[PDB]
């Protein structure tokens, strides 16, 4: 299972 | 902006035994960017049923793909792999070395 958070640059 | 050149390896999944069913593989590694075109040649003319792996890269962010197909090696037939990438001026070709 992969991360649930959105990560923007 | 900085491009790496593709490294090609043509080989069989199992030892080459004429007449027995086997898989032909062309593995490309260490190239960038991701765009690339790869065909498999049977005595010059290309094949049609050529599956490939999903795009993925190594720790240095260089991509790698596998182009495989099913076939039966023979005595006279020569197989090859043709690749084209942005870092080349013409399609690169690699002959399958059945005896190495």
């Amino acid at each position: 299972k992969q991360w649930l958070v959105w990560l923007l640059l | 902006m900085i491009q790496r050149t593709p490294k090609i390896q043509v080989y069989s999944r199992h030892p080459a035994e004429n007449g027995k069913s086997n898989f032909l593989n062309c593995y490309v590694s260490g190239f960038h960017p991701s765009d690339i075109e790869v065909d498999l040649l049977k005595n010059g003319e290309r094949i049609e049923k050529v599956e490939h792996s999903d795009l993925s890269f190594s720790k240095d962010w260089s991509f790698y793909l596998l182009y495989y197909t099913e076939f039966t090696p023979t005595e006279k037939d020569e197989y090859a792999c043709r690749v084209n990438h942005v870092t080349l001026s013409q399609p690169k070709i690699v002959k399958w070395d059945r005896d190495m």
Partner: protein, 275 residues
């Protein structure tokens, strides 16, 4: 031994077709088990291993939502970096992300990594302490600050030390019969007369898992690193890997060179010598 779950994401922008192309793959150790292709009609996280199909449809729905979210955030990151490096809309660019977790033989948390790259160069990485970031150029400094603001470090660490390792264990014990294995290599040696006063000794080691392998040549005990042809470990297609290492030998001196092989499947390393 030690196991690892790593996720890979690749997004490439193509002005003229609008929406970039987004491909993502998942690996446990050296075995791919999931995939997602943007331009695929499926539009869902598809399986690539047989031990993952056991999971129900809810699992696949969640993973699909997640990966689609990651695709969106990549579609934003492309434009954002285009602005940072002040580049034109007429140019194609690639955004790559890799992150995962490792566990030791005790099946506990050892390491965790997360890193972004723009056009093959490292953009921003997570140091192995999981608290601070490594920023490459001035553009990545802005990202580093933004992430230091929202406490992204603590969150990402909470994920890596929790869910990541847990479901890595689940994947290992589900696909136990394949992931938990050590296939020793099947080595042999060929000798081709390149010329009358030279020769080539090729050391084949094929059909082994995992891919981690060491394959060297020695002359009279010392390494021949300067004169050894060494291809990169390549897949076979059936879940095993192949690799060979050749050396150029003066004719009549074959008995001086030895091929050394090390792999998890070999109790003790192997030492080969022609004839």
């Amino acid at each position: 031994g030690s196991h690892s779950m790593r996720y890979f994401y690749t997004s490439v922008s193509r002005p003229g077709r609008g929406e970039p192309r987004f491909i993502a793959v998942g690996y446990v150790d050296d075995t791919q088990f999931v995939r997602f292709d943007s331009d695929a009609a499926s539009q869902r996280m598809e399986p690539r291993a047989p031990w993952i199909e056991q999971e129900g449809p809810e699992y696949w729905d969640g993973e699909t939502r997640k990966v689609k979210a990651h695709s969106q955030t990549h579609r934003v990151d492309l434009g954002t970096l285009r602005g940072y490096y002040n580049q034109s809309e007429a140019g194609s660019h690639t955004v790559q992300r890799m992150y995962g977790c490792d566990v030791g033989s005790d099946w506990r948390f050892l390491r965790g990594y997360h890193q972004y790259a723009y056009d093959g160069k490292d953009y921003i990485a997570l140091k192995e302490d999981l608290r601070s970031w490594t920023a490459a150029d001035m553009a990545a400094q802005t990202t580093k600050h933004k992430w230091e603001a929202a406490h992204v470090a603590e969150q990402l660490r909470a994920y890596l030390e929790g869910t990541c390792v847990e479901w890595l264990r689940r994947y290992l014990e589900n696909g136990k019969e394949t992931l938990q294995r050590t296939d020793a290599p099947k080595t042999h040696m060929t000798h081709h007369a390149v010329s009358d006063h030279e020769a080539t000794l090729r050391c084949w080691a094929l059909s082994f898992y995992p891919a981690e392998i060491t394959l060297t040549w020695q002359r009279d005990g010392e390494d021949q690193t300067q004169d050894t042809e060494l291809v990169e470990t390549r897949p076979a297609g059936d879940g095993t890997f192949q690799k060979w290492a050749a050396v150029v030998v003066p004719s009549g001196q074959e008995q001086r060179y030895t091929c050394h092989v090390q792999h998890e499947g070999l109790p003790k390393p192997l030492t080969l010598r022609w004839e």
